[PDB]
Amino acid sequence: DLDTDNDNIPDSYERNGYTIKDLIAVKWEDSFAEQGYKKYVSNYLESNTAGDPYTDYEKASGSFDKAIKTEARDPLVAAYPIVGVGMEKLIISTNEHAQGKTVSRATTNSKTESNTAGVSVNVGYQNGFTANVTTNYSHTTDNSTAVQDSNGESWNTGLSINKGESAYINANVRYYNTGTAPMYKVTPTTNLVLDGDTLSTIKAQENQIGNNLSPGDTYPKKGLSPLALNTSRLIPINYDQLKKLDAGKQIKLETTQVSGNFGTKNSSGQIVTEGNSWSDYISQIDSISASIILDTENESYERRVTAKNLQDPEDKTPELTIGEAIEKAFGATKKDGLLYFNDIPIDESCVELIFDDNTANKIKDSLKTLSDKKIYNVKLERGMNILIKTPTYFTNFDDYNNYPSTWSNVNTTNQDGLQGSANKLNGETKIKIPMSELKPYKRYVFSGYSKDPLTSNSIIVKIKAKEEKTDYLVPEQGYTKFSYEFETTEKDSSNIEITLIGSGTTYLDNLSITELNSTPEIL
Amino acid sequence: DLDTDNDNIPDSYERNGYTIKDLIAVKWEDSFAEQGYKKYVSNYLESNTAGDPYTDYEKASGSFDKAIKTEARDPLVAAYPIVGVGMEKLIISTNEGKTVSRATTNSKTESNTAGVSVNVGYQNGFTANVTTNYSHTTDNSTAVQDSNGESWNTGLSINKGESAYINANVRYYNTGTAPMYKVTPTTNLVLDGDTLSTIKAQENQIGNNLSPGDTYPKKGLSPLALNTMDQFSSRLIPINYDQLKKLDAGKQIKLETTQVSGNFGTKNSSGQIVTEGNSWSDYISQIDSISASIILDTENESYERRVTAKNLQDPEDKTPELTIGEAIEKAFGATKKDGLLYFNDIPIDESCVELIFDDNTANKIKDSLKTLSDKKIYNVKLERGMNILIKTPTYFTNFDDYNNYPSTWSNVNTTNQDGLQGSANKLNGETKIKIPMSELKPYKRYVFSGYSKDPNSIIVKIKAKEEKTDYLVPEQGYTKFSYEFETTEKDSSNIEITLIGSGTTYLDNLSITELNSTPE
Ligand SMILES: [Ca+2]
Ligand SMILES: [Ca+2]
Ligand SMILES: [Ca+2]
Ligand SMILES: [Ca+2]
Ligand SMILES: [Ca+2]
Ligand SMILES: [Ca+2]
């Protein structure tokens, strides 16, 4: 009944109930939950709940641009375009025109690789902190290129460079967008950085790309030829970074400044993109909201959710926990105590959580007074960065099981697990997962949960690879988390074996294998 | 409720303390401290107490652009941006070819503490240091890194009459409480007074906005090289043989940004943000000649604020006067508990950190300290034209809950209550501390400060690049003492501090701060 800002939704509805249907607003009474209606929250002193250029009525009723992802319909999630720059194939040639000695290798681009290259796990996690801290944090704008089809051969042999001259560097690139917003006049600037030595900056301009970049869409639309860097000239190199590229180091490719417009619906007809720009609302959006990155093993996402400053009594904004922020940002079906993706069971004990130092200190300070000892029941504060890594393989001895092979000596007729059922242990437990299902020259982490209701009934684990190891683990009365690294080798090697021997009392649950980063191959 | 200046705040509420809740202004009742509210005071003749474009109510109610810091919420602190430039790498080639590449570290406040002079024993209640040359956070100084004694011309076969070329890596930062929309720097480059070449950059080549605390090369990214410049695309900065021989000696490259320009954000009826008609040109001249400057330097970050103050000899202005401590608490996000100020966890006080004034205001502080009876420098009034710098120690102990040293002090007992603040040490025997060079920066200048009392002789011994032993007789009260030393490179020995007393003496608040960088 009371209106304050320039929105049709009243003051009494802008807290504790938000339903919008047939372009009018009605409250929430938990009765139309499964008819496609949801409940939101917003402020009451500002027209825009975030820094986006849409009002809270204009973004929670569908009366805005149709190209925006539907997860940004919630007023606590801001539309934000993030353009990243990807590499596919590296071509080196020794001519300045476009014959000569040329080599060409096939690479894969990794998005969240420099973020999690400074993560080292412990054998046991003290207190209830079930997450690790990274040395540095980077968003999904930079990429690291890993060469796969590379036998033992130097780059200098294929070019025959003696003292002072060198060859030229050409590449194949693509232009991805991972966020809940499109751009229209896309003009990105990107450094091609080799460990601090900026070789060149590529600017795509306008006519080489087109007048659109839809969210979740590259410029080569799925199955198409990649964009080579010839259509605005070649990139040179010298004979001091060739052995630097040869021995251990990899080419980083990072965008720095990205310019573009946005579309607003006019009075009469379709959208316009002339008098708008995504360069002014970026500073407004980034100074109020947090930053959550989700890394599914086939695609990546990154969102900004507005938070609450707890050292302010005047500030009236909604406050969220970590799990509610994840559910509102990425979209998650709420199963019985669980958060679900389309097929991925994200939770606090089924993924890997990465924070930087300030976020880790804030969470470790806040977890002392919590009465439930879980990460997801932590209040959100403005200015933290969270990374979620979905493991490649994960089983919980339940309806979800996607390991390439099957285990041995597994009994599932029990119910005293962390999430429902568990695995009774009697003797040995073996798994021989082959190298053909594993990416070569990487680093992997095997993580799991253990529980034994006895005094000193321990277990031994053993990981067999090129760098094999054996470990001894003692459990406790409660559920304890263990993590162990191993490193892989090229595709012409043996299988990866994981063995563990118990003593007939211990219980295990939530066994997962995830990837961390790439190791340098000796060349 | 009579209103002389139109800002929808009554003059009776504006003269005393007042606060804002539920988007209305109410008086101060001295009971909102535990809830989280704060008190404000503003002039009643002018709608804008400071020279900022925002009015009193808009600044004091948080209705401005949300990109500024929340420490500019009070109307007595201006909100204007102070951008700066730092330099992180050096590449020299003789090509218009050999190439030499080295790494450098930048310091924001290094010309501020270049000319300070330390002394043993402070013969007043002043307990502070006086500098000769004052430089803000806009100026910055760069220092070279590990070269193993190699000459800078042994890789470049250049004789007299030829010119080498400078290629550098530049990182742009902000240290204020305002975003800098449409930034355009016009920075310089000086070596022993000689401007080699100015450096000019435009809006649409670096980040168009600079939010206040962010960086144009983002954290985890790479610095912006000057080879990726429009005007530095075919020529570089020339260098003669005399200039490179000066750099080979004890000299360093400093960078000072002279003048910047751009707009600021506002609010619109139809849209939200426009940054065209506004400008940060005619407002900086109002801010810089009406207020006083405070600089804080914590071990990872520096801040610079400007706080408006009452003029002395002119009754005609009614700006609210402040003490030094209240202005320090208002300028930064400082929380006061038990009579002590804490910024976030690092303490700031008159006896805990090293505070430096310039030469013009130290006489004013010393003359105002004679009339005061508390004999503390955090109680003197603030006038127009004071310059304060605060340096927090890297290592500091008070024999209490706060400790930062990487090695435990030997022979320490804190079961007393007769100290200056909290518990204190008793030197029944002698205290010793070893500290390794891996925990310290190489080729720097450090000072070590503390407080001693004897209700006897105290012999101090510092092992450094020059070992120094000295004697000090303490008085019945408390006197601040300090001793300077210098360090050596990374692969040298450790650093020893030994303090031997007489049995009936007390020590408190032992700190080590960094001042300068010695030339190699
Ligand atoms: Ca409303
Ligand atoms: Ca509203
Ligand atoms: Ca289970
Ligand atoms: Ca006023
Ligand atoms: Ca007024
Ligand atoms: Ca003390």
Residue numbers in the entry:
A (entry chain A): 218 to 315, 319 to 451, 457 to 748
B (entry chain B): 218 to 313, 320 to 678, 682 to 746
Q: Anything the authors wrote about it?
A:
CDT is a member of the Iota family of protein toxins which also consists of two homologous toxins produced by Clostridium perfringens (the Iota toxin) and Clostridium spiroforme (C. spiroforme Transferase, CST). All three Iota toxin family members are assembled from two polypeptide chains termed the “A” subunit (CDTa, Ia, and CSTa) and “B”, subunit (CDTb, Ib, and CSTb). Once proteolyzed, the mature form of CDTb forms a large heptameric, soluble structure referred to as the prepore which binds one molecule of CDTa to generate the toxic moiety, CDT.
Further classification and refinement of the CDTb dimer led to a map with a final resolution of 3.56 Å, with local resolutions consistent throughout much of the map (S3A). Modeling of the CDTb dimer resulted in the assignment of two chains that we call ‘Chain A’ and ‘Chain B’, both of which were observed in a prepore-like configuration with three additional nodes of density that we modeled as calcium ions in agreement with previous studies. The modeled portions of the two chains are nearly identical in structure with a low backbone RMSD (0.945 Å), though differences in the residues that could be modeled do exist. The receptor binding domain (D4) was not observed in either chain in contrast to previous structures though additional density is present, indicating the D4 domain remains flexible during toxin assembly. The surface formed between Chains A and B accounts for ~1,200 Å2 of buried surface area and relies primarily on structures formed by residues 411–423, 477–484, 504–513, and 534–541 from Chain A and residues 237–240, 278–290, 427–434, 439–451, and 490–498 from Chain B for assembly. All residues contained within this interface are also observed in the structure of the symmetric heptamer, reconstructed from the same dataset. One site of interaction comprised of structures formed by residues 384–388 and 456–463 of Chain A and residues 314–318 and 451–454 of Chain B was observed in the previously defined structure of the CDTb prepore but is not found to interface in the oligomeric intermediate suggesting it is only engaged in the fully formed toxin.
